[PDB]
């Protein structure tokens, strides 16, 4: 393991970011048929499934990330417009928004993207039509409907 500056590089062969305590946006690695990003969006109330839609940077499309552990790479996630609650799991194979207790999620970086999984790695966050207005889902991973990208705001 190593690097150099006259016969090697990093800025064109490997990622250049990492997660930290702050405000972020989360969108699918496959965009949408609209020719634009497909990002997590607040469903308009509490105790409902998370939804996915186009992105403009609005208070219902932007989120926060906060650490919970380091031995398990687990964090908590909340919308910037309703941080009095956070993303949780309705036990019905879909994510929901609910007041805080101890609900957490696992994040992973790769050579050209991000991933989002449960605390036991048995499942991953995914979609079924990869289009706006769809409710987010949880199940086995998928090459073009179960991978993500994350950016700081």
Ligand X SMILES: CO[C@@H]1O[C@H](CO)[C@@H](O[C@@H]2O[C@H](CO)[C@@H](O)[C@H](O)[C@H]2NC(C)=O)[C@H](O[C@@H]2O[C@@H](C)[C@@H](O)[C@@H](O)[C@@H]2O)[C@H]1NC(C)=O
Interacting residues toward ligand X by CB under 6 A: 88-89, 91, 98, 101-105, 118-120
CB 75 to ligand X: min, Å: 10
Identify the CA nearest to 64 among candidates 28, 26, 27, 94.
26
CB 70 to ligand X: min, Å: 13
Residue closer to ligand X by CB (options 78, 131) is 78
Residue closer to ligand X by CB (options 64, 132) is 64
Residue closer to ligand X by CB (options 18, 102) is 102
Which two three-digit tokens encode residue 80?
């910037």
DSSP-assigned states of every residue in 3-21: --SSS--STTTS------S
CB 35 to ligand X: min, Å: 33
> 111-136 b/e with 16+ CB inside 10 Å = b?
eeebbbbbeeeebbbbbeebebeeeb
CB 31 to ligand X: min, Å: 27
Distances (CA, A) of 143 to 26, 114, 151: 17, 12, 20
End-to-end CA distance of the chain: 32
Which two three-digit tokens encode residue 106?
């696992």
Residue closer to ligand X by CB (options 95, 130) is 95
CB 9 to ligand X: min, Å: 37
Residue closer to ligand X by CB (options 103, 148) is 103
């Amino acid at each position: 393991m190593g690097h150099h500056h006259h016969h090697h590089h990093h800025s064109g062969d490997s990622p250049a970011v990492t997660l930290s305590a702050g405000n972020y946006i989360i969108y699918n690695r496959v965009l949408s048929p609209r020719g634009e990003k497909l990002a997590l969006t607040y469903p308009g109330r509490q105790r409902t499934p998370v939804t996915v839609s186009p992105l403009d940077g609005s208070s219902e499309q932007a989120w926060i990330l906060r650490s919970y552990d380091s031995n398990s790479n687990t964090w908590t996630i909340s919308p910037v417009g309703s941080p009095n609650s956070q993303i949780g799991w309705g036990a019905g194979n879909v994510p929901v928004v609910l007041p805080p207790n101890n609900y957490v999620w696992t994040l992973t970086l790769t050579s050209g993207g991000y991933n989002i999984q449960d605390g036991k790695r048995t499942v991953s966050w995914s979609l079924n039509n990869a289009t706006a207005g769809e409710e987010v889902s949880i199940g086995a991973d998928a090459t073009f409907s179960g991978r993500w990208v994350i950016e700081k705001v």
